[PDB]
Amino acid sequence: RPTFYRQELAKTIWEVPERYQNLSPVSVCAAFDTKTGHRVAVKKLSRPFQSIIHAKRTYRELRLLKHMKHENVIGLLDVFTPARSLEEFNDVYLVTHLMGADLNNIVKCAKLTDDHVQFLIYQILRGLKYIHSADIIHRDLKPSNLAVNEDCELKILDFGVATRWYRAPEIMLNWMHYNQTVDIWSVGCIMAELLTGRTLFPGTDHIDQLKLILRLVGTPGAELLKKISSESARNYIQSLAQMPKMNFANVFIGANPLAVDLLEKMLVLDSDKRITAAQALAHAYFAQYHDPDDEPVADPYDQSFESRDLLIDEWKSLTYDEVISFVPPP
Ligand SMILES: Cc1ccc(-[n+]2[nH]c(C(C)(C)C)cc2NC(=O)Nc2ccc(-c3ccc(CN4CCOCC4)nc3)c3ccccc23)cc1
Numbered sequence: 001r002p003t004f005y006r007q008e009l010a011k012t013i014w015e016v017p018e019r020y021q022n023l024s025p026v027s028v029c030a031a032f033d034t035k036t037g038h039r040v041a042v043k044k045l046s047r048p049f050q051s052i053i054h055a056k057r058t059y060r061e062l063r064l065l066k067h068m069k070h071e072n073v074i075g076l077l078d079v080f081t082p083a084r085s086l087e088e089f090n091d092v093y094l095v096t097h098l099m100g101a102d103l104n105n106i107v108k109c110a111k112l113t114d115d116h117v118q119f120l121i122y123q124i125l126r127g128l129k130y131i132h133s134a135d136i137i138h139r140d141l142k143p144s145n146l147a148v149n150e151d152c153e154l155k156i157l158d159f160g161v162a163t164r165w166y167r168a169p170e171i172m173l174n175w176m177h178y179n180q181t182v183d184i185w186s187v188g189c190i191m192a193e194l195l196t197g198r199t200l201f202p203g204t205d206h207i208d209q210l211k212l213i214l215r216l217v218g219t220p221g222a223e224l225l226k227k228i229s230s231e232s233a234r235n236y237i238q239s240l241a242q243m244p245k246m247n248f249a250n251v252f253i254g255a256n257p258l259a260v261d262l263l264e265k266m267l268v269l270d271s272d273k274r275i276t277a278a279q280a281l282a283h284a285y286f287a288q289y290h291d292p293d294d295e296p297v298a299d300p301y302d303q304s305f306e307s308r309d310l311l312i313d314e315w316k317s318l319t320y321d322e323v324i325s326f327v328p329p330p
Pocket of ligand 1: 028096156
């Protein structure tokens with residue numbers, strides 16, 4: 001066992017090992033990792049075991065981060081607790097490499113060059129292909145969930161910019177039976193945004209959002225229309241069939257034609273027809289970076305627990321289990 005030291009940052013108390021120095025708020029804190037001489041990010045889980053929800057939510061995030069090992073996905077450097085036993089196990093801290101900024105700020109500086117868009121979207125798809133391997137769906141892919149530093153290297157993550165604007169329609173209206181291409185749809189909204197600099201579908205609510213989406217992609221067709229279970233949506237769609245649609249080559253005038261093609265294949269209402277992460281990686285638009293041998297999938301991930309209903313102390317224990325069994329990366 002290490003040796004921690006107390007400290008209070010903006011009301012929050014912090015008990016981390018001497019190994020980490022210069023804690024500076026950013027709730028997460030920026031710190032210096034004395035063991036590697038690298039700057040890190042330290043997130044103290046708020047009230048991890050306050051309710052069964054937080055306990056499961058706390059356990060879920062720990063299991064995930066411990067499983068993610070890809071250059072384009074946030075990875076767990078360290079997970080510690082000032083607790084010396086399970087009984088006194090009330091605090092959880094997670095550690096990762098510090099980073100530059102959201103794809104927000106890193107875009108506020110410009111509109112991004114076509115090569116920058118290729119490289120950025122290319123790393124999102126590479127990280128996406130990986131996590132999709134473990135049958136994991138992000139469900140909240142958006143500018144603020146992407147970390148990019150100076151080198152222009154990207155990494156996906158989830159902080160827990162309306163997520164709305166990027167949400168796929170199957171998921172926004174809910175039919176309970178989606179797929180991983182919910183994420184690809186979001187990628188299309190971000191990609192489009194980098195190329196144009198402006199938000200593709202800046203709706204005000206779920207009703208506004210849909211109007212925006214349809215005015216571009218058009219109203220559902222027979223094939224897509226006979227796949228909608230809920231009559232409620234079925235009726236709405238077949239009613240508001242009035243929205244002057246568009247033709248991508250126009251909506252994105254002057255963009256790499258390879259780029260507008262990709263979008264066409266990402267921004268489809270039919271999740272059954274939407275391109276996948278692995279398929280987009282092979283799109284000619286990324287021909288400059290694509291390498292089928294450096295685009296790894298993930299080991300299978302056990303999501304059994306998602307369906308279990310346990311006490312707070314049980315989720316707490318499994319969480320403690322995960323904390324002790326942590327094997328730091330090389
Ligand atoms: C209930 C549940 C379940 C899962 C869940 N997921 N899922 C994922 C996927 C694998 C799907 C992408 C990731 C993820 N959670 C995640 O990545 N958590 C974190 C987010 C964010 C930070 C974090 C904050 C500020 C900063 C500092 N600023 C400087 C400027 O640039 C932006 C970043 N850095 C990092 C962080 C830090 C340490 C440790 C963890 C962290 C989140 C909640």
